[PDB]
Design a binder for these strands. Structure first.
Length: 1312
RNA sequence: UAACUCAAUUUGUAAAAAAGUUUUAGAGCUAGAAAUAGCAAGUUAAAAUAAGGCUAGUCCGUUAUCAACUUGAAAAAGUG
DNA sequence: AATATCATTTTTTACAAATTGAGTTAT
DNA sequence: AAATGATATTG
């Protein structure tokens, strides 16, 4: 005999609550063993509790770091390739130069070669630096001067350019030739094109308004306003947007039908140049051939300040400028401080700590930090006018290596690197030979669709080798299969067929697919004429022409376009009604319209003899994005088509993948039938059934063939779509249940109920970039951490105006303005900004028992289309916002958002249940049907929430970690109630298998049956049918109150080994310490600094001896030593040696207790401690305030009737404060802190009812389980009191819990 | 539940940049036995960027998974 | 012991798959 | 983005 029982679960990112309830809504107890060496052979625990765990974590930080560490190894190899070239001819100059370079970091003692790296004396080295104060000086010289230079100074320039090579964002060779002499050349090449609209510049120097410090479109609106007669959305406007790095649309201007757009930083441009100038003539080339001169000139102007006349290294020469100015301006500010305020010299030029010039150079102070310190000393000191004008444009004392060198493309470095090579090959012969490689080394880059050049040891690699050999930048295209690999890169991510899980899946843009998508969507359209008694489905036999005419001849088909064109001509049918599709058919033949256009043929592109060649021509377009790859793949089928006919094929690319196979669409047929699902979706006779219909018809073998042709737990919890954060809860939820079921003598429960809970520059990336995209200079009138307050975020989100009625708005008296939800919170529980809108008055949106009325919808409807076009608000926000302009939320929509409030539709929640329902229900019946012994009830997350609000079971988060466990209990109760009082709903609330107020009443009143005061409900609620009673409002409503008063709750925190980085990443300078950790085996951090603050993986209880005196007389010890993440693998290989090498002697190998983090110690008087590492503990103690003082505190913080119970039963405060002190004294042991709490509770009794309540809630963080934390009692912060010794544990009682908490094993550490 | 259309999120992967940091080049100059005064400099660079690891790749090295006992390389099972 | 200071950062390109919420057709 | 262990300074 074991009684009927249920299970409640509350699944969080940080907590799984659980609870075990029985038939009369009670939660048992039980008397489990206690193993180990203690006094106690046993103990009684309640079957309610929680599991706390540290949040799980995304793979990103780890991925970023890994990708970031490949980059590092590759840059080492780049130089290691440059060096190997310079190998043999460098020896003939310098016996060992590259050797000085590798040991440069080494202090002079460990040094092997003469401490001077370049020349290996002083005279020459000292005299290298004078002559070339920056590498850039050596860069320019070597590029310009024609004198045969030193082979080493040549290596140094090359490597610098190769080592820090700049970016790969631009394709095609640009070449710096350069603003107002190149602008004017665009005004004139356009003036004699548009001879009727002759644009005039009239002397104004564009140079100025272009090469200024403002952003892209902001400098465009400075010129279109200047040139009055020219449209900014015109061609010269669109050709000023292509000149400052935007992407225009050139279609309408020349009368074209296609969105022919061009970006001037891709190879798709030179193809997309020949395709625009093959629609409009060849004489329209010197417009984009003027823009491309100006465009690059605009990419230059920004990143260099010198003329291309003087130099051939404008970058390097640009940098020399920044230097010279730095030299000049510094020199100035020197004599200028002497002259004026010499009293403040040492602080600026000598004291690093303070953010002066010393602090800029030798100190940790950046440019920003230095600029904001000196601005106020430049401003007072007269005769410092330009220095500020410099400063206040970001141009004062520039270093040549800056945050913003990120704009240099490798183009610009390839620039100089070539010149140098080009120079010195004349003299050195191995530069002529190897000019190729050296430039390639800079150039070559592993394409993203190959990934790691691995040889079958990389979990991450996927790329296929054409032959086996080492890969190089030079032998790469030969010894790697670029295409195969670029195929595999996709093929390995894209789904297989749900209905043939071995089979692949077709591209979203496959002809074969796109035919199937239309012929699914037409075989169900009905029509109606004048003389037709019932609306008839589409003519099976005569559909094979309704596609021929209307769907082929253009890319989108209109219901009016059909009802007119087919009913006017084809169908001779004057009027026509339509029941299938709304306004325009979802299914278009984008492919057919696109392919006809390209290949100029609907005779062979409508030719369903052989289609199989064209199946790979659209795969190739979807598979690949790098055009060069496309070129290869496509060359075969170019045998038929000419230049134009297999060249504008490289143009049209395709995006995406379909959800269905080639087989399932047009293979898997029937012997009984004699056609395929794509050939039966062309006339199911006079029936014309669907795709989904065709699958689940007993009439054919489809229904089974699919189920016919069809991993562990971890595996299955991995494969779920959701934060890996929650996927932790789900797995532990499943291990919890698995245990509970064993606790109940391996008897499955009756029921299981589940439940589940829920960048200020990133807001100024769509706020600032949305506001500043309508045009208004309002961000110049009223310009990050202010958006987190909700009304200021939303005020700045609506162009400083009302959202319903367009009025302008106020900042100072902005508190009177109310934040009305679009879909009233009565239907949707959206706390999100997407649903929340602010206005002068919420009563000025229209009634709150529907959607925003049609008048405001009319008025501000154009305004609502505007905010979307600027990206401030989305389609779903706008869509609903106008929903009264598309009918209004009906009584069925209402009824919808009142059921969706309580029925869980969220996909993860359903998957959780699918796992639990499968895991429990493992048996079958006589007809092969599943035995549903266990019922999985998925309940939304705001039944119990309000259930507590309603029947006074209020939760206070701050008191202890019990609520997560209570919540699992409550969910069981209500889960078992809403399943007996409405036992129909096991097909709405159970994983198994307008008169709209019917459903709205039902679901909006479903919770009411608990009550006895609606506007008069019975007592014993029951089944309306069966003699099964469910809720005895007398008795049941007081068990629950009872259960929440049980103080003993099983709270358990998962003991976790720590993983990840070894230590704070910061490389600290050389400190004579023992804490510093050597960054490399042979880099004594005495000499070279290193890391400190290792993370510790786990601690171990070492009991052994340690020699004492010069005697070496063994003393005995027993302590916690922490094994560090980095130490870990060494300690694990052989733990005795590891420790022996730490000083430990004759270690007791049997007594090494592995002690991971959160490991739980019971000291004395139930004072408990969890260790965080090896040398600090954290509060292991959970205090149970009685239901009494809990329920009080909600109201005391916060209808009119129970406000009485606040002032009455008041000065509970003293009894509450007490319990806390009788904790803070027993288990907590943080004296002076408690002796502030008190000495500051007494001080503030004159303060109100609530003020004293709120500040008690704060008080708990003292008694809270976990790590100590600071907290404010009114205006007195109280610092954390931490435990900074694990000595007190070493003799105490280590407790090993089980996941629930029920099965313990207590080990008393009185052992030497 | 399944296909479809339109628009946000989320997770996972690949290839790239610029910085930052550390040590070493970059002869400090005078007055003094020193302590310490004056004045001169400053912008650059090599190298490392998880210690490292064997599978030796232009690869891998920071996610996920973890009570205790007995059993297993492990995954995992058994135990109250 | 009480107390104070500390924590690598930013930027770009390419791809796939669920999920969510507003629509059409069904099982 | 905090939050909490490692670090070093205190009389």
């Amino acid at each position: 005999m074991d009684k009927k029982y249920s299970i409640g679960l509350a699944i969080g990112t940080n907590s799984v609550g659980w609870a075990v309830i029985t038939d009369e809504y009670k939660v048992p107890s039980k008397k489990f063993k206690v193993l180990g060496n203690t006094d106690r052979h046993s103990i009684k625990k309640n079957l309610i509790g929680a599991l706390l765990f540290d949040s799980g974590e995304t793979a990103e930080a780890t991925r970023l770091k890994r990708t970031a560490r490949r980059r590092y190894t590759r840059r080492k190899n780049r130089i290691c390739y440059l060096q190997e070239i310079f190998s043999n001819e460098m020896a003939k100059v310098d016996d060992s130069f590259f050797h000085r370079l590798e040991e440069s970091f080494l202090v002079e003692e460990d040094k092997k070669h003469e401490r001077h790296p370049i020349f290996g004396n002083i005279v020459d080295e000292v005299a290298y630096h004078e002559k070339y104060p920056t590498i850039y000086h050596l860069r320019k010289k070597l590029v310009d001067s024609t004198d045969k230079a030193d082979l080493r100074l040549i290596y140094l320039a090359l490597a610098h350019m190769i080592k820090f090579r700049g970016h790969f964002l631009i394709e095609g060779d640009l070449n710096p030739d350069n603003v107002d002499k190149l602008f004017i050349q665009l005004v004139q090449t356009y003036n004699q094109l548009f001879e009727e609209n002759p644009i005039n510049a009239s002397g104004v120097d564009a140079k100025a308004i272009l090469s200024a410090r403002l952003s892209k479109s902001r400098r465009l609106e400075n010129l279109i306003a200047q040139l009055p007669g020219e449209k900014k959305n015109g061609l010269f406007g669109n050709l000023i947007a292509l000149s400052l790095g935007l992407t225009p649309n050139f279609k309408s201007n020349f009368d074209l039908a296609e969105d022919t757009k061009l970006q001037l930083s891709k190879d798709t441009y030179d193809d997309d140049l020949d395709n625009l100038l093959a629609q409009i003539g060849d004489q329209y080339a010197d417009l984009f051939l003027a823009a491309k001169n100006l465009s690059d000139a605009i990419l230059l102007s920004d990143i260099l300040r010198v003329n291309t006349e003087i130099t051939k290294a404008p970058l390097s020469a640009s940098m020399i400028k920044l230097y010279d100015e730095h030299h000049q301006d510094l020199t100035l500010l020197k004599a200028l401080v002497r002259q004026q305020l010499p009293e403040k010299y040492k602080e600026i030029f000598f004291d690093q700590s303070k953010n002066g010039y010393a602090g800029y150079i030798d100190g940790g102070a950046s440019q920003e930090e230095f600029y904001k310190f000196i601005k106020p000393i430049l401003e007072k000191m007269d005769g410092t006018e330009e220095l500020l004008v410099k400063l206040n444009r970001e141009d004062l004392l520039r270093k040549q290596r800056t945050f913003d060198n990120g704009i240099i493309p490798h183009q610009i470095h390839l620039g100089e690197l070539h010149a140098i090579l080009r120079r010195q090959e004349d003299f050195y012969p191995f530069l002529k030979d190897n000019r190729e490689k050296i430039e390639k080394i800079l150039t070559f880059r592993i394409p993203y669709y190959v990934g790691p050049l691995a040889r079958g040891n990389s979990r991450f690699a996927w790329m296929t080798r054409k032959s086996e050999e080492t890969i190089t930048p030079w032998n790469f295209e030969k010894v790697v299969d670029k295409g195969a690999s670029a195929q595999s890169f996709i093929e390995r991510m894209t789904n297989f067929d749900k209905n043939l899980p071995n089979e692949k899946v077709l591209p979203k843009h496959s002809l074969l697919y796109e035919y199937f998508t239309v012929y699914n969507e037409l075989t169900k359209v009905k029509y109606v004429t004048e003389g037709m008694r019932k609306p008839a489905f589409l003519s099976g036999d005569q559909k094979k022409a309704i596609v021929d005419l209307l769907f082929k001849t253009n890319r989108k088909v209109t219901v009016k376009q059909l009802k007119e064109d087919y009913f006017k001509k084809i169908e001779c049918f004057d009027s026509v009604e339509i029941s299938g599709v709304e306004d325009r058919f979802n299914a278009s033949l984008g492919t057919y319209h696109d392919l006809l256009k390209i290949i100029k043929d609907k005779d062979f592109l409508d030719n369903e003899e052989n289609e199989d060649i064209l199946e790979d021509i659209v795969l190739t377009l979807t598979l690949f994005e790098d055009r060069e790859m496309i070129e290869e793949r496509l060359k075969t089928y170019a045998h038929l088509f000419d230049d134009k006919v297999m060249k504008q094929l490289k143009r049209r690319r395709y995006t995406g993948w379909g959800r269905l196979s080639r087989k399932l669409i047009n293979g898997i047929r029937d012997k009984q039938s004699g056609k395929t699902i794509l050939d039966f979706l062309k006339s199911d006779g006079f029936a014309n059934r669907n795709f989904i219909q065709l699958i689940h018809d007993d009439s054919l073998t489809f229904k089974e063939d699919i189920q016919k042709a069809q991993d562990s737990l971890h595996e299955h919890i991995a494969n779920l779509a959701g934060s890996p954060a929650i996927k932790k809860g789900i797995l532990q939820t499943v291990k919890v249940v698995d245990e509970l079921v064993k606790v109940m003598g391996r008897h499955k429960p009756e029921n299981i109920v589940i439940e589940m809970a829920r960048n200020s520059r990133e807001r100024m990336k769509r706020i600032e970039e949305g506001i500043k995209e309508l045009g208004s200079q309002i961000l110049k009138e009223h310009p990050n951490t202010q958006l987190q307050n909700e009304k200021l975020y939303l005020y700045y989100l609506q162009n400083g105006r009302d959202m319903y009625v367009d009025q302008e708005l106020d900042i100072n008296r902005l508190s009177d303005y109310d934040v009305d939800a679009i879909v009233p919170q009565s239907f949707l529980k959206d706390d999100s900004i997407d649903n929340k809108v602010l206005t002068r008055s919420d009563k000025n949106r229209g009634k709150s028992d529907n959607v925003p009325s049609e008048e405001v919808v009319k008025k501000m409807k154009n305004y609502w289309r505007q905010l979307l076009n600027a990206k401030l608000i989305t389609q779903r926000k706008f869509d609903n916002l106008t929903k009264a302009e598309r009918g209004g939320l009906s009584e069925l929509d209402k009824a919808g958002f009142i059921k969706r409030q309580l029925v869980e539709t969220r996909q993860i929640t359903k998957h959780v249940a699918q796992i639990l329902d499968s895991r429990m229900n493992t048996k079958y019946d006589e007809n092969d049907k599943l035995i549903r012994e266990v019922k999985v009830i998925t309940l939304k997350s705001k039944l119990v929430s309000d259930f507590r609000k309603d029947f006074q079971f209020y939760k206070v988060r701050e008191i202890n970690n019990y609520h997560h466990a209570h919540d699992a209990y409550l969910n069981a109760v209500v889960g078992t109630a809403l399943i007996k009082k409405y036992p129909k709903l096991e097909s709405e609330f159970v994983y198994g298998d307008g008169k709209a107020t019917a459903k709205y009443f039902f679901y909006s009143n479903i919770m009411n049956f608990f009550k006895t005061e609606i506007t008069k409900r019975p007592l014993i609620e029951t089944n309306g049918e069966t003699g099964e009673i469910v809720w005895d409002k007398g008795r049941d409503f007081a068990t629950v109150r009872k259960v929440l008063s049980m103080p003993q709750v099983n709270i358990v925190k998962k003991t976790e080994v720590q993983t990840g980085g070894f230590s704070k990443e910061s490389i600290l300078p050389k400190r004579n310490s023992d804490k510093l950790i050597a960054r490399k085996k042979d880099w004594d951090p005495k000499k070279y600094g290193g890391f400190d603050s290792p993370t510790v993986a786990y601690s171990v209880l070492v009991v052994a001896k340690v020699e004492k005196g010069k005697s070496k007389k063994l003393k005995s010890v027993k302590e916690l030593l922490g094994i560090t993440i980095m130490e870990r693998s060494s300690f694990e290989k052989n733990p005795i040696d590891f420790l022996e090498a730490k000083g430990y002697k004759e270690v007791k190998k049997d007594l090494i207790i592995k002690l991971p983090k959160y490991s739980l110690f019971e000291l004395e008087n139930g004072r408990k401690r969890m260790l965080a590492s090896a040398g600090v503990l954290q509060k292991g103690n959970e205090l149970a305030l009685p239901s009494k003082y809990v329920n009080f505190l909600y109201l005391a913080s916060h209808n009119e009737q129970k406000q009485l119970f606040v002032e009455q039963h008041k000065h509970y405060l003293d009894e509450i404060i007490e319990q806390i002190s009788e904790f803070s004294k027993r288990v907590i042991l943080a004296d002076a802190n408690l002796d502030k709490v008190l000495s500051a509770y007494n001080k503030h009794r004159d303060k109100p009812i609530r003020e004293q309540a709120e500040n008690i809630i704060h008080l708990f963080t003292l008694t809270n389980l976990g790590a100590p934390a600071a907290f404010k009692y009114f205006d007195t912060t109280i610092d954390r009191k931490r435990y900074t010794s694990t000595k007190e544990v070493l003799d105490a009682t280590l407790i090993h819990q089980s996941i629930t908490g029920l099965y313990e094993t207590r080990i008393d550490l009185s052992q030497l």
